[PDB]
Design a binder for this molecule. Sequence first.
Ligand code: V21
Ligand code: NA
Ligand code: ZN
Length: 257
Amino acid sequence: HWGYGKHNGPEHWHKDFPIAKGERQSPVDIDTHTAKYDPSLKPLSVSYDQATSLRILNNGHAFNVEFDDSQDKAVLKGGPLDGTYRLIQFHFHWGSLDGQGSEHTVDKKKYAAELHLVHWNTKYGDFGKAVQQPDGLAVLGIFLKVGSAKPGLQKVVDVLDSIKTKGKSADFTNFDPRGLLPESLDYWTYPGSLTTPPLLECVTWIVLKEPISVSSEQVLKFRKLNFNGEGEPEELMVDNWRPAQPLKNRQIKASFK
Ligand SMILES: CSC1=S=Nn2c1nc1ccc(S(N)(=O)=O)cc12
Ligand code: NA
Ligand SMILES: [Zn+2]
């Protein structure tokens, strides 16, 4: 029932998922000036060399590129993390216009889109168990601005016409997620939640300071996807972002400056 419309959008989610008004919800606005520099934060360790993408799926909320997470093939560690976290999938949130689409904001600035690379703590054995733990997930968030094309994104964009509507999936092998990363791994970090139902408060957020640039044609292809199923009338998959939630009793930490 939940989605991103006038009658089922983020402002309605609390009725089915009361944790929507919880103490550690995501996303948030990142106030760059009040973020606390922590010189004891380690560099982020991204080990994606052995990544195995499997499939791409339109789930009716976004599209997800799924990975083989049955071994330590693509892992996140270091940074603010004590554990090793396995890459399970990535997806994006994006807007109807280039001026909105990101979930996190930076000094109230919205980006055109936001990439989430979702990882789960291996000490919990699977994703389903990890989401029930306050240190279960690490989501690496990367902002997208519209400018030059991201060549490493083009394989994703090109396959989207095959997964136009809710429920559709396609084989998607040999995709290298390293082609989606900016030059710098400087980051902000804070404890938060899934940004869609069930909104579980299980995520260590790591948001990269440097956005990647994608072209207008690339983001236009995102906007041609459908929220609806093949049988159903067309609602374009746009503005599938949750707005910033109250920071409450949390501090955002910075690895830099
Ligand atoms: C196997 S279901 C699954 S795998 N990764 N995720 C899932 N549900 C999610 C719901 C939300 C997010 S988010 N927007 O990265 O906080 C990631 C999710
Ligand atoms: Na919707
Ligand atoms: Zn997300």
